[PDB]
Design an enzyme around this catalytic site. Structure first.
Site, PDB file in Angstrom:
ATOM      1  CB  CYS A  59      -0.948   0.082   1.223  1.00  0.00           C
ATOM      2  SG  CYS A  59      -0.529   0.186   2.944  1.00  0.00           S
ATOM      3  NE  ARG A  93      12.431  -0.680   4.174  1.00  0.00           N
ATOM      4  CZ  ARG A  93      13.017   0.501   4.044  1.00  0.00           C
ATOM      5  NH1 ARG A  93      12.942   1.417   4.994  1.00  0.00           N
ATOM      6  NH2 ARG A  93      13.691   0.770   2.930  1.00  0.00           N
ATOM      7  CG  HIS A 192       8.583   4.644  -2.724  1.00  0.00           C
ATOM      8  ND1 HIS A 192       8.814   3.648  -3.648  1.00  0.00           N
ATOM      9  CD2 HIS A 192       8.633   4.050  -1.510  1.00  0.00           C
ATOM     10  CE1 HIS A 192       8.988   2.500  -3.020  1.00  0.00           C
ATOM     11  NE2 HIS A 192       8.885   2.716  -1.721  1.00  0.00           N
TER      12      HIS A 192
HETATM   13  S1  ICS Z   1      13.178   1.613  -1.142  1.00  0.00           S
HETATM   14 FE1  ICS Z   1      11.969   0.000  -2.075  1.00  0.00          FE
HETATM   15  S2  ICS Z   1      10.559  -4.046  -1.638  1.00  0.00           S
HETATM   16 FE2  ICS Z   1      14.159   1.063  -3.089  1.00  0.00          FE
HETATM   17  S3  ICS Z   1       9.918  -0.355  -1.385  1.00  0.00           S
HETATM   18 FE3  ICS Z   1      11.014  -2.085  -0.696  1.00  0.00          FE
HETATM   19  S4  ICS Z   1      14.888  -1.081   1.038  1.00  0.00           S
HETATM   20 FE4  ICS Z   1      12.775  -3.627  -1.853  1.00  0.00          FE
HETATM   21  S5  ICS Z   1      13.725  -3.732  -3.894  1.00  0.00           S
HETATM   22 MO1  ICS Z   1      11.462  -4.337   0.491  1.00  0.00          MO
HETATM   23  S6  ICS Z   1      12.511  -0.031  -4.246  1.00  0.00           S
HETATM   24 FE5  ICS Z   1      14.282  -0.339  -0.954  1.00  0.00          FE
HETATM   25  C1  ICS Z   1      12.861  -1.676  -1.381  1.00  0.00           C
HETATM   26 FE6  ICS Z   1      13.760  -1.617  -3.170  1.00  0.00          FE
HETATM   27  S7  ICS Z   1      11.277  -2.220   1.474  1.00  0.00           S
HETATM   28 FE7  ICS Z   1      13.232  -2.395   0.435  1.00  0.00          FE
HETATM   29  S8  ICS Z   1      13.725  -4.487  -0.021  1.00  0.00           S
HETATM   30  S9  ICS Z   1      15.699  -0.564  -2.641  1.00  0.00           S
HETATM   31  S1  CLF Z   2      -4.266  -0.445   3.133  1.00  0.00           S
HETATM   32 FE1  CLF Z   2      -7.275  -1.204   8.675  1.00  0.00          FE
HETATM   33  S2  CLF Z   2      -6.135  -1.339  10.683  1.00  0.00           S
HETATM   34 FE2  CLF Z   2      -4.739  -1.371   8.834  1.00  0.00          FE
HETATM   35  S3  CLF Z   2      -4.222  -3.539   8.539  1.00  0.00           S
HETATM   36 FE3  CLF Z   2      -5.890  -2.863   7.227  1.00  0.00          FE
HETATM   37  S4  CLF Z   2      -7.943  -3.427   8.299  1.00  0.00           S
HETATM   38 FE4  CLF Z   2      -6.202  -3.546   9.849  1.00  0.00          FE
HETATM   39 FE5  CLF Z   2      -4.299  -1.525   5.163  1.00  0.00          FE
HETATM   40  S5  CLF Z   2      -2.154  -1.342   5.890  1.00  0.00           S
HETATM   41 FE6  CLF Z   2      -3.474   0.290   6.756  1.00  0.00          FE
HETATM   42  S6  CLF Z   2      -5.756  -0.413   6.848  1.00  0.00           S
HETATM   43 FE7  CLF Z   2      -5.084   0.811   4.894  1.00  0.00          FE
HETATM   44  S7  CLF Z   2      -3.352   2.139   5.505  1.00  0.00           S
HETATM   45 FE8  CLF Z   2      -2.422   0.299   4.324  1.00  0.00          FE
END
Ligand code: ICS
Ligand code: CLF
Ligand code: FES
Ligand code: FES
Ligand SMILES: [Ca+2]
Lengths: 477, 522, 121, 121
Positions: A59, A93, A192
């Site tokens: 998301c 993360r 992003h």
């Molecule tokens: S920010 Fe992006 S999915 Fe560039 S959302 Fe994701 S820490 Fe991946 S391939 Mo998780 S665009 Fe970074 C990424 Fe790559 S979270 Fe990390 S590994 S280099």
């Molecule tokens: S798209 Fe809402 S409390 Fe949140 S996990 Fe969901 S039912 Fe439970 Fe999703 S993660 Fe959140 S709720 Fe939206 S912004 Fe993105």
């Protein structure tokens, strides 16, 4: 496999889909042709996800709070909305940092408004102000507040920009409202973009009229490196042994002061193009700061990137770059000599978010491993333009692959190793196929620079040649 | 630098002198960090009793919650059934987060799908998303049932699931006889345990509401067992093994133990085991229905009493000695089967274990948190051991549960200094353990940071964490443990006593300073 | 967000303060403030609420998602040139012509111009 | 006063905060903020600094004096229709096209558009 076998496999996989879903998914699959420069002739990308097909995307909230705004340590990140979104993304993360958590650093803490049913009906603009007051009361050493919107926030019509402005005027504190609702984008990429827009509009321009910073011709900033497992650190040292002074990191182990000092540098080194090109272009347009993309995966790419960055500067920097390369040459040569014989000829299939499916290819090439297929979750056509020149001929490409498509592709191709996220790890670990988490480095790393290459090779050797993959078939069957 | 024979990962590579110098230069030049004296002053201020008073006056800020959203429990309940695909009507980030959470906890594949609703669905509703998602999900993964939950987007929008599914069946996207139970699971009401209740209630409605005319209570001579939101496969296995030894005919509704634990034998199984649809249809013909966790299965209790006409016995969760005895006696009364000797011997072994280890558990002070039923069962078991649960916390708790826990505490001398908190998060618990220091903590993996906070103040103030609950991320294969019945009581007792002994060994290992108490026999 | 509604029908341009990101999609704002944009459908497949949106701040333009419904309607009307479609698809930047029933207000200053006519002409 | 400078030459429209009624006449503002309107004279008889000014507030338009020099220059360029000249003469309302070196900023929101070309064409 040739281009004829791969296309037959692609059609056989798509045969099970309903006709509309089949037509949509036929556009996102292709067989690589390195002579093609315009990927739009082959692969469509950044399209919505087909409902009910179990995609792997996320998301906009994950893209903004989880990825960009999260690694900032000196700020407090409120998750405005219910508890779940903030709870699931807490400390999932591995963006490392240095600080006293709960006092001056708040990366691994979950701040949320915890919406109840009385806040969905009567709004939550007063709850936000009271929460800001309590945050200022209980955490006095915070250097800013960022209010990341969850899904209900946009739907119930809550004005958080007004609250942010009023409370920033009152407390003289930087409050950034991010409209990173989960439904606003098809994947994390729009997260992003939204996070970069918030940074540009609320944080970046604070010190436009300040000239007290002592600038040097060697100032650089690391952009789009989120310090996964220490990655940014392993890069930063490599940029300070060449004489350059890294003024800021975006955003792993980053602080709100480095972001404001970023416009005072001479070059922006962008590692993740996908998540930070939006702010790199803005800085180039406004402050005139040039930016360039560098790759620190593997020895070859690291050497090439260091030589390019040195070429961006004068002769002393180039001499220091040559000294660094000469110094680190034997270290990675020993790693290659030890591990390449074990990892020679192995075939890899990758599926990562938006940058690493093409960045880590060089690292696998340096170990004699062939990437027989790569793909992204939320990459645009630019990313595939850059990818098509990296993959070999007749290699499979996929975009926003589903569980069924990926499973069938893996079953036919039978790769020696698979690199993807946590949601696919055990699926392929029950199939007897070694798996490496290429997101969090499988709780290992760092993988950037010359110090990370040894760890990369060691992990690949320990996973591919583990004796646990020969025992799946019961001896009595 | 790296050595080809001694390769160092992120720890302890960044402890080298060059990395230390680089980080120090970064901090000094660009981070504009506060002076270390100010940081130490603020940290000591957070540990004072004055800070706790400000912390407990929080009304709009929640820090480190101890609960999740309803659709997580809804997804687990959907996984409980055979060939059932969880299908969450809403945005797609929620499903990704659910799958990541459950993969990190169970370390097994979790299969859930979404409608990938977006800004067009926020304006014009998500009916077409529902239709296309149902069609694609049935065509691609071929489930025997699709269990529909909702995120908070679909609830705020006001999407009518019944209308969307009925219009989907009549349009021809899915066959009219294909079972598609649905439930409304708003993420801003209750927590994850409430979503499990709502999903199970919806499934039971779908399978039993239109066919209660020809149902007789006691036709199949079986007992229905509703486990609830359970995240220990050992609990599912023990609750079936005890009944199998007892000879009681039972039907475990929503049993996910099989899908959440599949063999690694070269093939991937998206579905395995689970409660069949025949069992759900035949459920009203059972002698009686027992809810293992009655403090979050209230709506299910209402549906079972009102519709199935089963008089659900008032039982507590089978955690501890007394409540396990009560559960066994109630099951024997309902089914008529006498309790066999294989369970009396197990109870005697548990009592022997309690008597052997009472000299180390007596007087120990514990701070706990988790789900209402689990927390109250743990408190009862701690009171049975002679321990003092000084701090009791349950973020997703109500005042009736708090009153029941207070009644339990008042019925024992050890529940004298105990204080029950509802609506409080883990920051409140950090404040509580700094000012009123317990001896240990019992909770999920989120309590480790609290321990790290206690160590920073000093080794004499450290509060070790005992990991019992959900989720457990920093330890491997603890989801295979047991907490229900006598076996679960044995495992919990073993964990507690061994954690106490390990802490005592750690405190008394310094040679010629405290090692005089380093007894070989402890 | 400040939205300036301009049209030949309107005697004067109207300045409106709006809350960004509401489920009301700049039609709701127009209907609240009395601006008469022709809205003649409830699903989103007509072009009547076509407007031209100019970002007056320039350096504050926000990223947005161009849904396939809105893209198809704009292409059916003929106000989505190939270059703008490519820009929206790749760089997430909004096109010049939008549908006032599907456009979510962002935190910027916008000038919305309509002709009081359906999208096609 | 908020002035939004727009032009095909400019990559993005620029938002500028300005002080109303200064002797600098919206050229000074453009030169301070880097906006490049072609000014090629010092008396006021050329048409180069021709711009098109749109009052975004509509209900906040201020009365102004259209000097005979500016009126004659606009008529020589051909951007002053009879109706707008009559409106300026009678009701004191500004015309749509102005000369950026003779236009005194008023306390309102304005959109100034230029083509980077002299007034005549
Ligand atoms: S920010 Fe992006 S999915 Fe560039 S959302 Fe994701 S820490 Fe991946 S391939 Mo998780 S665009 Fe970074 C990424 Fe790559 S979270 Fe990390 S590994 S280099
Ligand atoms: S798209 Fe809402 S409390 Fe949140 S996990 Fe969901 S039912 Fe439970 Fe999703 S993660 Fe959140 S709720 Fe939206 S912004 Fe993105
Ligand atoms: S009114 Fe039909 S498209 Fe907006
Ligand atoms: S520049 Fe000559 S008219 Fe203004
Ligand atoms: Ca496993």
């Amino acid at each position: 496999m040739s281009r004829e076998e791969v296309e037959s496999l692609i059609q056989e996989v798509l045969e099970v889909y309903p006709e509309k879903a089949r037509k949509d998914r036929n556009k996102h699959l292709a067989v690589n042709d390195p002579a093609v420069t315009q990927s739009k002739k082959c692969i469509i990308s950044n399209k919505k996800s087909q409902p009910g097909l179990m995609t792997i995307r996320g998301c906009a909230y994950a893209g903004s709070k989880g990825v960009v705004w999260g690694p900032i340590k000196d700020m407090i990140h409120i998750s405005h909305g219910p508890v779940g979104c903030g709870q699931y993304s807490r400390a999932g993360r591995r963006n490392y940092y240095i600080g006293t958590t709960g006092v001056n650093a708040f990366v691994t803490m979950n701040f949320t408004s915890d919406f109840q049913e009385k806040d969905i009906v009567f709004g939550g603009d007063k709850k936000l102000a009271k929460l800001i007051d309590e945050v200022e009361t209980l955490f006095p050493l915070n250097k800013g507040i960022s209010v990341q919107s969850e899904c209900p926030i946009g739907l119930i019509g809550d004005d958080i920009e007004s609250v942010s402005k009023v409370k920033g005027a009152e407390l003289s504190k930087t409050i950034v409202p991010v409209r990173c609702e989960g439904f606003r984008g098809v994947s994390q990429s729009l997260g992003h973009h939204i996070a970069n827009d918030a940074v540009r509009d609320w944080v970046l321009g604070k010190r436009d009229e300040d000239t007290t910073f002592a600038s040097t011709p060697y100032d650089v900033a690391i952009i789009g490196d989120y310090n996964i497992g220490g990655d940014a650190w392993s890069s930063r040292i490599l940029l300070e042994e060449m004489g350059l002074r890294c003024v800021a990191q975006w955003s792993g182990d980053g602080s709100i002061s480095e972001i404001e000092l970023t416009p005072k540098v001479k070059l922006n080194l962008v590692h993740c193009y996908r998540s930070m090109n939006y702010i790199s272009r803005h800085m180039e347009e406004k402050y005139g700061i040039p930016w360039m993309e560098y790759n620190f995966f593997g020895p070859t790419k690291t050497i090439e990137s260091l030589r390019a960055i040195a070429a961006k500067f004068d002769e002393s920097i180039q001499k220091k770059c040559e000294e660094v390369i000469a110094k680190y040459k034997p270290e990675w040569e020993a790693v290659v000599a030890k591990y390449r014989p074990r990892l020679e000829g192995k075939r890899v299939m990758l599926y990562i978010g938006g940058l690493r499916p093409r960045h880590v290819i060089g690292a696998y090439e340096d170990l004699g491993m062939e990437v027989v297929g790569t793909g992204y979750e939320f990459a645009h056509n630019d990313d595939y333009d850059r990818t098509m020149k990296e993959m070999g001929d007749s290699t499979l490409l996929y975009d926003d692959v589903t569980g069924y498509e990926f499973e069938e592709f893996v079953k036919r191709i039978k790769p020696d190793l698979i690199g993807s996220g946590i949601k696919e790890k055990f699926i392929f670990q029950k199939m007897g196929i070694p798996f490496r988490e290429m997101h969090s480095w499988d709780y290992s790393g760092p993988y950037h620079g010359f110090d990370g290459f040894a760890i990369f090779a060691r992990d690949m050797d320990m996973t591919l040649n583990n004796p646990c993959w020969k025992k799946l078939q019961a001896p009595w069957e | 630098s790296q050595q080809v024979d001694k390769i160092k990962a992120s720890y302890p590579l960044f402890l080298d002198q060059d990395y230390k110098d680089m980080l120090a230069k970064k901090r000094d030049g660009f981070e504009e960090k506060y002076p270390q004296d100010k940081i130490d002053e603020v940290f000591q201020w957070t540990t004072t009793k004055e800070y706790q008073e400000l912390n407990f006056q929080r009304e709009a800020l929640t820090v480190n919650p101890a609960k999740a959203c309803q659709p997580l429990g809804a997804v687990l309940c959907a996984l409980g059934f055979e060939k059932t695909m969880p299908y969450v009507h809403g945005s797609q980030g929620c499903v990704a987060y659910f799958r990541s959470y459950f993969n990190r906890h169970f370390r097994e594949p979790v299969s859930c799908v979404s409608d990938s609703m977006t800004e067009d669905a926020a304006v014009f509703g998500g009916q077409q998303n529902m239709k296309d998602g149902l069609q694609n999900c049935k065509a691609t993964y071929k489930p025997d049932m699709i269990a529909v939950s909702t995120t908070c987007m679909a609830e705020v929008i006001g999407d009518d699931l019944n209308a969307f599914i009925n219009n989907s069946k009549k349009e021809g996207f899915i066959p009219d006889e294909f079972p598609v139970p649905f439930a409304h699971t708003p993420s801003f009401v209750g927590s994850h345990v409430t979503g499990w209740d709502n999903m199970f209630e919806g499934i039971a409605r779908y399978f039993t509401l239109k066919s209660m005319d020809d149902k007789v209570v006691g036709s199949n001579k079986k007992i229905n067992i509703v486990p609830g939101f359970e995240t220990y496969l050992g609990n599912f296995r023990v609750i079936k093994r005890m009944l199998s030894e007892m000879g009681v005919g039972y039907s475990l509704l929503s049993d996910p133990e099989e899908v959440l634990d599949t063999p690694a034998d070269g093939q991937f199984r998206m579905y395995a085991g689970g409660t069949t649809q025949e069992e759900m249809k035949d459920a009203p013909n059972a002698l009686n229905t027992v809810l293992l966790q009655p403090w979050h299965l209230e709506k299910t209790k209402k549906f079972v009493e009102g519709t199935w006409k089963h008089e659900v016995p008032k039982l507590n969760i089978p955690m501890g000695l007394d409540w396990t005895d009560e559960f066994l006696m109630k099951v024997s009364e309902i089914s008529g089967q006498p309790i066999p000797a294989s369970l009396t011997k197990e109870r005697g072994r548990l009592v022997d274990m309690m008597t052997d280890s009472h000299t180390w558990l007596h007087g120990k002070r514990f701070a706990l948190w988790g789900d209402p039923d689990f927390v109250m069962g743990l408190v009862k078991f701690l009171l049975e051991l002679g321990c003092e649960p000084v701090h009791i916390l349950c973020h997703n708790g109500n005042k009736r549960w708090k009153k029941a826990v207070d009644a339990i505490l008042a019925a024992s001398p050890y529940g004298k200094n105990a204080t029950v908190y509802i609506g409080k998060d883990l920051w409140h618990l950090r404040s509580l353990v700094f000012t009123d220091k317990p001896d240990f903590m019992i909770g999920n993996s989120y309590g480790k940071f609290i321990q790290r906070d206690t160590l920073h103040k000093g080794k004499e103030f450290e509060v070790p964490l005992i990991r019992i609950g959900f989720p457990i991320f920093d330890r491997h294969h603890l989801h295979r443990s047991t907490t229900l019945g006598y076996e679960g009581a044995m495992q919990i007792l073993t964990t507690l006593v061994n954690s106490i002994l390990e802490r005592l060994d750690e405190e008394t290992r310094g040679m010629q300073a405290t090692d005089y108490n380093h007894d070989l026999v402890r | 967000a400040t939205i300036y509604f301009s049209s030949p029908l309107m005697p004067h341009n109207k300045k409106v303060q709006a809350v960004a990101g509401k489920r009301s999609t700049l039609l709701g704002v127009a209907q609240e403030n009395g601006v008469k944009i022709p809205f003649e459908c409830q699903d989103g497949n007509c072009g009547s609420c076509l407007v031209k949106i100019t970002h007056l701040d320039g350096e504050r333009i926000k990223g947005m998602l161009l849904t396939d419904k809105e893209r198809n309607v704009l292409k059916s009307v003929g106000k989505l040139p190939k270059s703008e479609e490519e820009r929206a698809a790749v760089r997430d930047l909004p096109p010049t012509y939008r549908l006032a029933c599907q456009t979510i207000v962002t935190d910027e200053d916008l000038l919305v111009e309509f002709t009081g006519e359906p999208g096609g002409a």
